[PDB]
Amino acid sequence: RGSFVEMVDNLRGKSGQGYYVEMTVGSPPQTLNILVDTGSSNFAVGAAPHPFLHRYYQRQLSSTYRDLRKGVYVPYTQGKWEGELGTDLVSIPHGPNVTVRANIAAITESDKFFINGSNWEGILGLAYAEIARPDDSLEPFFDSLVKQTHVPNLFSLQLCGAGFPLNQSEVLASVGGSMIIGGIDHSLYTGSLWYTPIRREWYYEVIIVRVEINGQDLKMDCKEYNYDKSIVDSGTTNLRLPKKVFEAAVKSIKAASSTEKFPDGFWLGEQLVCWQAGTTPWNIFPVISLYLMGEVTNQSFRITILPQQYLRPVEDSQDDCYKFAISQSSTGTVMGAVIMEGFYVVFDRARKRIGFAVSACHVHDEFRTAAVEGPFVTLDMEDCGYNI
Numbered sequence: 016r017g018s019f020v021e022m023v024d025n026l027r028g029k030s031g032q033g034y035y036v037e038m039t040v041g042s043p044p045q046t047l048n049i050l051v052d053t054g055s056s057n058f059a060v061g062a063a064p065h066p067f068l069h070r071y072y073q074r075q076l077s078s079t080y081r082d083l084r085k086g087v088y089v090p091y092t093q094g095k096w097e098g099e100l101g102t103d104l105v106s107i108p109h110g111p112n113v114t115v116r117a118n119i120a121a122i123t124e125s126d127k128f129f130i131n132g133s134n135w136e137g138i139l140g141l142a143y144a145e146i147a148r149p150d151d152s153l154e155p156f157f158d159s160l161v162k163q164t165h166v167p168n169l170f171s172l173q174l175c176g177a178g179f180p181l182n183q184s185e186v187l188a189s190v191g192g193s194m195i196i197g198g199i200d201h202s203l204y205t206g207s208l209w210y211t212p213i214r215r216e217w218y219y220e221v222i223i224v225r226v227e228i229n230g231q232d233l234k235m236d237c238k239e240y241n242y243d244k245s246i247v248d249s250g251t252t253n254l255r256l257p258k259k260v261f262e263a264a265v266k267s268i269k270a271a272s273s274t275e276k277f278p279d280g281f282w283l284g285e286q287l288v289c290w291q292a293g294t295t296p297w298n299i300f301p302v303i304s305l306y307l308m309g310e311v312t313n314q315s316f317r318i319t320i321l322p323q324q325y326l327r328p329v330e331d332s333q334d335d336c337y338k339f340a341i342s343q344s345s346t347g348t349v350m351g352a353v354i355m356e357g358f359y360v361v362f363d364r365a366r367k368r369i370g371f372a373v374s375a376c377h378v379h380d381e382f383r384t385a386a387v388e389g390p391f392v393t394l395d396m397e398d399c400g401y402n403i
């Protein structure tokens with residue numbers, strides 16, 4: 016049974032541009048579309064005109080706006096923003112029926128942060144205070160929400176990839192998924208939920224203990240899989256792997272799909288590959304299984320994704336085109352949107368654990384499905400975690 020009907024189907028977007036939820040800030044309420052990001056901890060919104068924004072937060076029009084008289088500069092390689100800190104009343108129209116006083120970073124200047132055509136005007140950082148900017152004294156939105164209300168300390172995400180490209184109008188009209196605040200909606204998944212511990216509360220950090228490509232063990236020291244960390248990040252498009260893991264995984268994926276040769280640019284995630292309408296050879300591409308530390312001692316479980324997850328649909332023609340959505344990282348494993356699209360993901364902050372179940376909206380074919388299975392007997396799993 017599905018017990019959170021008001022929050023089901025409250026997301027829009029896609030893996031390449033991000034998934035967002037509608038929010039309101041200020042008095043009277045100012046509506047904004049907000050990127051759902053489990054990989055950061057700031058609630059930051061556009062608050063000045065920008066060519067790629069059609070709306071922004073107007074603090075002078077909010078009677079409940081409180082100025083914190085403090086600036087914040089947050090530079091990332093993926094985009095940078097400068098903001099002015101303050102507080103205001105915040106609601107999630109298709110969320111719990113509560114109004115919170117929360118910190119807001121009013122973005123006044125930015126460099127390649129807002130993306131042309133994304134439809135979002137801000138970011139909802141759902142990770143922990145440890146990685147909030149300027150420091151951990153700036154309470155993240157979800158912490159304020161739990162402290163001020165009776166909403167349980169848990170949220171769950173069902174990110175829904177369409178399995179095909181969505182044009183400018185389609186992406187605005189389509190349901191991109193669900194963010195259930197304070198609970199688990201049982202209609203969003205099939206089978207059982209399996210839980211992996213949150214290693215440390217900063218990013219949503221996890222431990223990967225084994226990797227298979229079509230059941231074939233990648234056979235690397237498991238520390239390599241979590242070098243220097245492994246995180247679950249709705250604000251990353253790809254499955255990102257540490258350099259050495261990426262090189263071994265791409266070699267194995269190429270060997271499994273060897274009946275068809277792809278250009279170097281395809282494996283670099285830069286070039287698209289196209290096939291005649293309806294003829295994508297899904298079967299030649301292998302499944303990928305990530306084994307995660309279980310809640311019970313010496314116990315693991317696996318999550319299995321299909322090429323329908325790691326081949327991201329892109330428009331070219333009537334051909335079906337894709338980009339390879341597995342890429343190299345120098346900052347550890349990132350289980351991005353293309354992985355999350357296969358699963359219903361429960362961020363159980365109260366019990367310091369992350370749940371995975373097969374998503375009711377994952378893209379598959381008649382021959383294979385994504386899977387969440389266990390238990391498996393796995394020894395010295397603590398040794399898989401990286402230190403320093």
Ligand SMILES: CC#Cc1cncc(-c2cc(Cl)c([C@]3(C)CS(=O)(=O)N(C)C(=N)N3)s2)c1
Pocket residue numbers: 029030031032033034052053054055091093094095128130138248249250251252352
């Ligand atoms: C699925 C999707 C998506 C998507 C699309 N367009 C923009 C973004 C982001 C830009 C920035 Cl900046 C982000 C930060 C705050 C820093 S980051 O290091 O780039 N990062 C990986 C993260 N999780 N948070 S997300 C995400």
